[PDB]
Amino acid sequence: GSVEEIRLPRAGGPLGLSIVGGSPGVFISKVLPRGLAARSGLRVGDRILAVNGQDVRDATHQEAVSALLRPELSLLVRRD
């Protein structure tokens, strides 16, 4: 497995993704072809490990949702 650091420039618009899982793990389920997530390297199946340094490895689904949206955003993901 591989780990990558993704960077999405916060623009007050749709980040361009959808996530599933939590309490095991938050995985990206959809990536808009025209969205920010697709333009910045995100892919379906990636596990979100950290949101701007906050560890979301074992975060609840809503814990991850707040981290993602609560106010450039850095996502560290695991990818196989």
Binding site: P14, L17, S18, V20, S29
Partner: peptide, 7 residues
Amino acid sequence: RTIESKV
């Protein structure tokens, strides 16, 4: 059970 959150 399952949630999909569009952000």
